[PDB]
Design a protein around this nucleic acid. Structure first.
Ligand SMILES: Nc1ncnc2c1ncn2[C@@H]1O[C@H](COP(=O)(O)OP(=O)(O)OP(=O)(O)O)[C@@H](O)[C@H]1O
Ligand SMILES: Nc1ncnc2c1ncn2[C@@H]1O[C@H](COP(=O)(O)OP(=O)(O)OP(=O)(O)O)[C@@H](O)[C@H]1O
Ligand SMILES: Nc1ncnc2c1ncn2[C@@H]1O[C@H](COP(=O)(O)OP(=O)(O)OP(=O)(O)O)[C@@H](O)[C@H]1O
Ligand SMILES: [Mg+2]
Ligand SMILES: [Mg+2]
Ligand SMILES: [Mg+2]
Lengths: 441, 193, 390, 393
DNA sequence: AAAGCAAGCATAAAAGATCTAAACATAAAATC
DNA sequence: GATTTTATGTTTAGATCTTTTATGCTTGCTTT
């Protein structure tokens, strides 16, 4: 069954492209060339520079840095003058961990085989004494600070105050390149650090605000490329791995496809994207969030369904994953609740509807429930205890929140809009009719 | 009768994931029961099938303090039957130490809680949830000294903590009954002058 | 071995060093006149004679000379808005005094310096002063005792030593002990100390315990760049005036005028013209002095645009700026009813609120308390309609 | 992807769809994994057993290194990193030493190997609803650990909350949401009826009674018993472990009049409505003046601040001098104020018969606010065992 | 005349935010 | 080379400063 092996090859290739492939960048011809010419200027001429990429989360910030470094590193003039210092704000929490990763990753003489000796104050004074020794004859340091705002959350912003002060003195030819999401992170810096900063910023707001190039990108990600592009990308990935992300990557050279199979697959994808149903589902997702990470997640959960028994992509699969996205889950949680919790919920609905969203309690809802319990002739058998367990179970699924004493006497607030409760009465299966007559009252 | 029933419950759980536990409805006063609990520990060091650390509520201001006093009390009870760092005594070290020692024989891991009422509810629910997470790999039993009545156990434990527990009640005699027995049998016994 | 090298660092006999470039540095002759104009326009290259600062230079020079010849010592407090060139001036006058001492017109002296933000704890400064004294390194309490022993004891010959202090305000503690000792040390007449502290706020000793570098006007900020450029005519004569007008009002940083001119020189390199035009400076000021909050609101997806209209409608309707999420969702359902496009169910709206909160268009709480999380508006309300229609 | 779902369907009936989804996302290990998979459902949906069976099945069958975890154990993040690296990097010994997220990321980065052995990793964090309560850099790192360590992992999370509770002020990356619906009544009947062979082989263990057990504990009889049980308890709970735990005991009390001689719904519908009263609970005196003090505490915490001049929103907090005044008024004997009586006050505090809200630092000043915590029924039992009615006040 | 609601008020306690004193584990060197 | 000791850098828990809110209490007006 070699054709089924061909489909397994297409599915593995597609999941590798949607998930991996950290280098390739689509669009952004201006900003990528700007960052690249800045990095060549700080690598060759010995200038010090500062830069601050900003954009919404899911815009290609890190992918731009990988494309720029993947272009520049195998030049072997950039590869001999530059020592690159990656840094992050999630991992390097307090500044001393960032400074240990700097001293390790610069291969400073104080460090040894991934471990550094001595006090942190000694490591700081030693790092400034090393950067002090540089003229233009020193190797160029390229700091890359991802999540700049958490570095602003450090004490005194103290590491940042040094990292820009080296840029404004003729010491080591560094290059600070912060990358962060907040669009007014420059306000967070203290006025000294704001003064030392070069104020240049580069914005990467995504270019696919219009619907048509969004459908073009969706047609792009599902297609199998022509084979000479696979050879060229294999040459590029091979040349970068000969000299960090490089140890695992897309690697097109493990995959090879017959051109007729590429033509049949891309004919299937352009025909599927021609239909009104798939365009409607992608229209819904494009109205939700333009960011390409969302579309790549939707594409991954579409591509994963390509079982051998049903080889081809179809528009009904687009509609199914779109129905999984657009539906709510609190309405899908309330249908899991048993009838006693649902009656406590509908009692909270009647209480906060009659008294207009006032806070409630177990005893007031116990009175409003026992007004129904004594006339129900199906809920007569329950006691205080089962209703109290149902109340605590409503508390621990966070359908009720405390206003922040006895377990039976906390103040509380409902967490739902009434349309969710009015919908969960409809979508519930086999609700007893007496609770429905209470729902209409 | 209650002490032999407790030792038989511990040995019958050694004969055996929802943890077994045996509440003992102690009277409202404390110090009379204390020596009783110590005798229970001696019985589990008589038959040598269980080691036991008391987990008084003074040691449980937070979940971290509860876990460290639990592990430190188990390892120091075992050393007393026959000095690792306070910052290092995690549950994982307890699992590695239990499989480091007790596997070719299965000694039970007892944690007396003499003052069930005095505990803060959140640290107690988190502790019973952690011990429920580790039962099966570590043979645990839990004994609750509830100074009042069963409604306190059913009320203080939340929906889910009660869902993951297997409690059985034993009763020591009531205090007026104890004064009646002490007065009929000793202070009114003829043989003292 | 690691032990010998860490002992070499702790006694300081091992010189710190970076790896040298394997390729040689690029030759000066190949540089373009625009490229040389950029290289002279870097902020690092401080001139030996600073333009338009001669009054403060002669003031600090006459002061430190009259305090360093007469062997008395004291304290001096220079202060001003950042970008005014304080540290460059005091380092320049100390450089002129040491060049004078090499010609022996002045008594010899050791120039110490610290920097408050290059420290960790403030008490670590006691190690650093002594680190530039004998060069020995020691714990801060023994450093405190040895700084006392060099200061408390009248033991001639006691050479005067200046103590430049970058960023005194970062040395504050709950006790304020280190800055208090650094101020009390000149008061000992026997140890002839003089300290020159450098600060931003003009009234710090009153605030939690002179000279003031006023910010540059339009003509001084013209003078600085037009002396920095040299004799090349790569800048037209009005572009420096345009920079001085758009920087002298906002903040007065010397660094801002310099890197604005440098980034404009880079844009002129992108245009492949050997001389700048004034529109290049307009483009550089439009890029480096900007917010993209208009472009961000223009480039959000349509549901976040509906959400952004609804928060503004809620601030209009209720009349308060901070809103509970439920009233915003009711206004959301009104606007989505009017536009004819359906709105996502409220969990996805919570996701949209968290995503716009990450981008600081709005200030939103953690989503554990949904439908009760507070929402401020961070972008001004007029910018929403200005980005959405125009 | 076929063998894993095919080996977990017989153990887990009525769950073929969610197993099909997880076995397509993280089934085959030659394929890459999505960066995070957040599956969620109600209590007792069957997800801890599902992910634990999935991790042990994949880590026994294929090349993956698996790690399970429970987030309540991780009261500080370094314990979480220790358990994760201790399972993901086997036989490290006591050379393991992780201090923060950076060291864990580097020591997981060194574990990367060649693609030709096609290794993968998996991580499951049970009770992930606690993860937002802790250090609050652990969730953003845990979602994008695949991008960060440049490995081939997939950090599963598990909770009952929907994912929308989890967001923070910095935002999180992409995640694969996955819902597990709780069973409708026919599927709960199918689950409880799957164990019919085990419960028959248990009933054979404990000879006329065994002679009628082997002839009349058949499949349709157990299906009729399951319909007769889910006619009663299904409205009170759908939590499948509790229905198993009660269904076996009620089968044990149900079987007596077919051990002797419908014709049974009355005999068991008696005890079943007592069995409903003991759902979730899992079972298998006071001094005289303390009685009067608990009575006066209920009077001080229910009969308001201004009704008490003429007798003499929830419960109201009260200072203890109000308690001693109501105790004097209700005592009708006027005891001297011995040390034992104020000790009785402090013992009602320690036994959770009273509670504190404020004034703990100056209890002897009398400014402390106390709060009686008892319902009407037991204080009526106290007034019965004294014989002194409390409804008059 | 007193009883009850109200403007406010004045300290109190409850996070909470941030810093400092005590503890404590580790590095490193003195010595046997 | 191994142990011990102790000097120190790191951690952690308490101390303290905001400020919120807030609620019991003051007392004062108002009302039946
Ligand atoms: N402009 C783009 N070109 C190509 N791929 C993109 C682009 N933007 C996003 N992606 C895809 O989105 C996923 C994550 O993108 P990316 O890493 O750039 O976000 P990010 O930089 O991590 O954002 P943040 O740093 O704010 O979390 C990647 O799989 C990548 O393929
Ligand atoms: N008169 C001048 N001529 C040319 N350049 C100047 C002049 N004054 C200041 N500068 C520029 O400004 C910078 C001065 O740096 P300096 O450290 O003195 O600033 P500062 O006022 O001390 O800032 P802060 O007080 O925030 O440290 C130098 O890089 C220099 O290029
Ligand atoms: N389809 C099924 N077939 C057989 N048994 C099932 C099935 N679904 C659930 N179970 C039973 O459910 C139990 C596991 O439920 P689980 O403990 O995963 O719920 P949970 O979500 O972890 O609850 P909590 O989070 O409150 O602990 C197992 O005993 C298992 O036998
Ligand atoms: Mg990124
Ligand atoms: Mg300065
Ligand atoms: Mg579970």
């Amino acid at each position: 069954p070699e054709a089924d092996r061909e489909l397994v090859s297409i599915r593995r290739f597609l999941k590798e492209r949607l998930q991996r492939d950290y280098t390739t960048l689509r669009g952004y011809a201006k900003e990528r060339s700007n960052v690249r010419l800045l990095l060549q200027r700080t690598a060759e001429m010995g200038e010090s520079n500062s830069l601050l990429l900003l954009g919404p989360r899911g815009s290609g910030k890190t992918t731009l840095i990988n494309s720029v470094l993947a272009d520049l590193l195998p030049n072997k003039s950039f590869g001999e003058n530059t020592l690159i210092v990656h840094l992050d704000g999630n991992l390097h929490t307090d500044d001393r961990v960032a400074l240990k990763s700097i001293t390790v990753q610069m291969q400073l003489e104080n460090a040894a085989d991934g471990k550094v000796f001595g006090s942190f104050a000694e490591n700081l004074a030693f790092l400034l004494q090393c950067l002090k020794a540089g003229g233009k004859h020193s190797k160029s340091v390229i700091f890359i600070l991802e999540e700049f705002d958490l570095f602003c959350a450090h004490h005194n912003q103290t590491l940042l105050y040094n990292l820009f002060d080296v840029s404004q003195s003729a010491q080591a030819p560094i290059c600070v390149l912060g990358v962060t999401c907040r669009l007014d992170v420059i306000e967070l810096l203290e006025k000294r650090v704001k003064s030392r900063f070069s104020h240049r910023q580069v914005f990467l707001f995504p270019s696919l605000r219009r619907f048509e190039d969004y459908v073009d990108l969706c047609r792009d990600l599902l297609s199998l490329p022509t084979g000479n592009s696979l050879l060229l990308a294999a040459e590029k990935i091979y040349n970068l791995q000969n000299i960090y992300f490089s140890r695992n990557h897309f690697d097109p050279g493990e995959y090879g496809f017959s051109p007729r199979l590429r033509d049949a697959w891309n004919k299937q994808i352009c025909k599927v994207l021609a239909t009104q149903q798939a365009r409607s589902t992608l229209q819904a997702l494009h109205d939700f969030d333009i960011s390409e990470a969302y579309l790549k997640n939707f594409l991954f959960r579409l591509v994963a369904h390509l079982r051998p028994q049903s080889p081809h992509i179809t528009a009904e699969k687009m509609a199914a994953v779109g129905s999984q996205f657009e539906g709510d889950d609190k309405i899908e949680l309330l249908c899991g609740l048993s009838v006693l919790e649902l009656c406590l919920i509908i009692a909270i609905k009647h209480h906060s509807q009659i008294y207009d969203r006032d806070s409630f309690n177990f005893e007031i809802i116990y009175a409003r429930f026992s007004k129904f319990a004594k006339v129900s002739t199906t809920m007569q058998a329950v006691e205080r205890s089962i209703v109290l367990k149902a109340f605590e179970h409503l508390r621990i699924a966070e359908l009720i929140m405390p206003l922040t004493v006895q377990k039976e006497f906390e103040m509380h607030k409902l967490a739902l809009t009434y349309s969710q409760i009015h919908h969960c009465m409809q979508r519930y299966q086999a609700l007893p009719t007496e609770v429905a007559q209470w729902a209409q009252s | 009768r209650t002490l032999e029933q407790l030792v038989d419950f511990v040995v019958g759980q050694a004969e055996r994931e929802v943890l077994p536990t045996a509440a003992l409805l102690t009277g409202i006063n404390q110090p009379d029961h204390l020596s009783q609990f110590t005798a229970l520990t001696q019985r589990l060091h008589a038959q040598r099938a269980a080691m036991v650390c008391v987990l008084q509520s003074r040691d449980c201001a937070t979940l971290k303090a509860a876990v460290e006093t639990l592990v430190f009390g188990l390892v120091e009870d075992n050393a007393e039957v026959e000095r690792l760092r306070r910052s290092q005594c995690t549950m994982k070290q307890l699992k590695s130490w239990y499989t480091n020692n007790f596997d070719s024989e299965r000694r039970q891991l007892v944690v007396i809680l003499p003052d069930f009422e005095c505990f803060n509810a959140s640290v107690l629910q988190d502790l019973i949830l952690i011990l429920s997470a580790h039962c099966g790999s570590l043979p645990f039993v839990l004994v609750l000294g509830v100074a009042t009545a069963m409604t306190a156990v059913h009320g203080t434990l939340p929906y889910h903590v009660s869902s993951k527990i297997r409690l059985r009640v034993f009763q020591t005699q009531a205090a007026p009954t104890g004064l009646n027995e002490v007065l009929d049998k000793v202070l009114l016994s003829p043989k003292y002058a | 071995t690691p032990s010998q090298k860490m002992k070499k660092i702790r006694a300081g006999e091992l010189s710190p060093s970076m790896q040298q470039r394997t390729d040689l540095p690029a030759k000066d002759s190949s540089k373009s006149e625009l490229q040389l104009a950029r290289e002279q326009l870097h902020v690092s290259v401080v001139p030996k004679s600073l333009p338009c600062r001669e009054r403060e230079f002669e003031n600090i020079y006459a002061f430190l000379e009259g305090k360093i010849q007469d062997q008395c010592g004291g304290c001096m407090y220079v202060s001003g808005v950042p970008g005014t060139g304080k540290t460059a001036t005091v380092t320049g006058v100390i450089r002129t005094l040491q060049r004078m001492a090499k010609q022996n017109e002045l008594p010899a002296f050791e120039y110490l310096e610290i920097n408050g933000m290059r420290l960790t704890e403030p008490r670590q400064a006691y190690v650093q002063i002594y680190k530039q004294l004998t060069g020995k390194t020691v714990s801060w309490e023994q450093a405190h005792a040895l700084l006392e022993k060099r200061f408390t004891t009248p033991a001639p010959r006691r050479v005067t030593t200046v103590l430049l202090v970058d960023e005194l305000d970062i040395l504050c503690n709950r006790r304020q002990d280190v800055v208090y000792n650094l101020l009390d040390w000149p008061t000992k007449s026997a140890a002839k100390l003089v300290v020159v502290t450098i600060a931003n706020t003009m009234d710090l000793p009153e605030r939690l315990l002179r000279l003031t570098f006023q910010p540059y006007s339009h003509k001084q900020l013209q003078e600085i760049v037009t002396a920095r450029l040299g004799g090349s005519e790569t800048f037209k004569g009005e572009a420096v005036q345009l920079v001085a007008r758009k920087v002298a009002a906002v903040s007065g940083d010397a660094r801002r005028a310099l890197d604005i001119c440098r980034r404009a020189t880079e844009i002129a390199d992108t245009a492949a013209v050997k001389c700048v035009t004034m529109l290049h400076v307009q483009q550089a000021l439009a890029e480096m002095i900007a917010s993209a909050k208009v472009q961000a609101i223009r480039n959000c997806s349509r549901m976040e645009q509906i959400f952004l209209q609804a928060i503004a409608a809620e601030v209009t309707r209720t009349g308060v700026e901070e809103t509970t999420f439920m009233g915003v969702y009711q206004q959301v359902e009104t606007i989505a009813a009017f536009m004819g496009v359906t709105f996502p169910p409220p969990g996805r709206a919570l996701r949209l609120c968290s995503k716009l909160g990450a981008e600081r268009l709005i200030i939103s709480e953690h989503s554990r308390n949904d439908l009760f999380q507070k929402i401020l508006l961070n972008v001004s309300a007029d910018d929403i309609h200005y980005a959405l229609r125009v | 992807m076929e063998a894993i779902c095919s080996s977990l369907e017989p153990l887990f009936p009525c769950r073929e769809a969610a197993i099909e989804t997880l076995g397509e996302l993280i089934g085959d290990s030659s394929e890459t994994y999505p960066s995070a998979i957040y599956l969620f459902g109600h209590s007792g949906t069957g997800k801890t057993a599902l992910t634990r069976a999935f991790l042990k099945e994949c880590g026994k069958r294929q090349n993956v290194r698996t790690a399970h975890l429970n987030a309540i154990e991780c009261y500080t993040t370094k314990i979480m990193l220790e358990i994760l690296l201790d399972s993901l990097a086997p036989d490290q010994g006591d050379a393991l030493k992780v201090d923060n997220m950076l060291d864990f990321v580097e020591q997981l980065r060194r574990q990367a190997a060649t693609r030709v052995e096609d290794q993968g990793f998996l991580i499951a964090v049970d009770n992930a609803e606690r993860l937002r309560d802790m250090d609050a850099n652990v969730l953003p790192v845990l979602l994008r650990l695949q991008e960060l360590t440049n490995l081939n992992l997939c950090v599963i999370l598990l909770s009952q909350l929907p994912f929308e509770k989890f967001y923070n002020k910095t935002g999180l990356s992409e995640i694969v949401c996955l819902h597990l619906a709780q069973y409708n009544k026919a599927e709960t009947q199918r689950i409880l009826g799957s164990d019919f062979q085990q419960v028959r082989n248990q009933l054979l263990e404990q000879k006329k009674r065994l002679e009628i057990c082997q002839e009349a504990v058949t499949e349709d009889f157990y299906n009729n018993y399951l319909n007769l049980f889910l006619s009663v308890f299904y409205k009170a709970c759908r939590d499948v472990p509790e229905l198993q735990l009660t269904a076996r005991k009620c089968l044990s009390t149900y079987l007596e009049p077919v051990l002797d001689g419908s014709r049974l719904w009355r005999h068991i519908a008696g005890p079943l409505r007592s069995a409903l009263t003991q759902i979730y609970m899992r079972i298998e005196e006071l001094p005289y003046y303390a009685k009067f003090l608990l009575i006066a505490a209920f009077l001080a915490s229910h009969n308001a601040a201004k009704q008490d001049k003429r007798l003499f929103l929830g419960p109201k907090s009260f200072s203890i001098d109000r308690l001693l005044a109501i105790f004097y008024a209700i005592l009708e004997e006027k005891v001297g104020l011995t040390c034992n009586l104020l000790s009785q006050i402090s013992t009602l505090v320690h036994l959770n018969l009273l509670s504190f809200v404020s004034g703990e630092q100056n209890i002897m000043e009398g400014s402390a606010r106390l709060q009686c915590t008892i319902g009407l029924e037991f204080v009526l039992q106290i007034g019965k065992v004294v014989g002194f009615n409390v409804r008059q006040y």
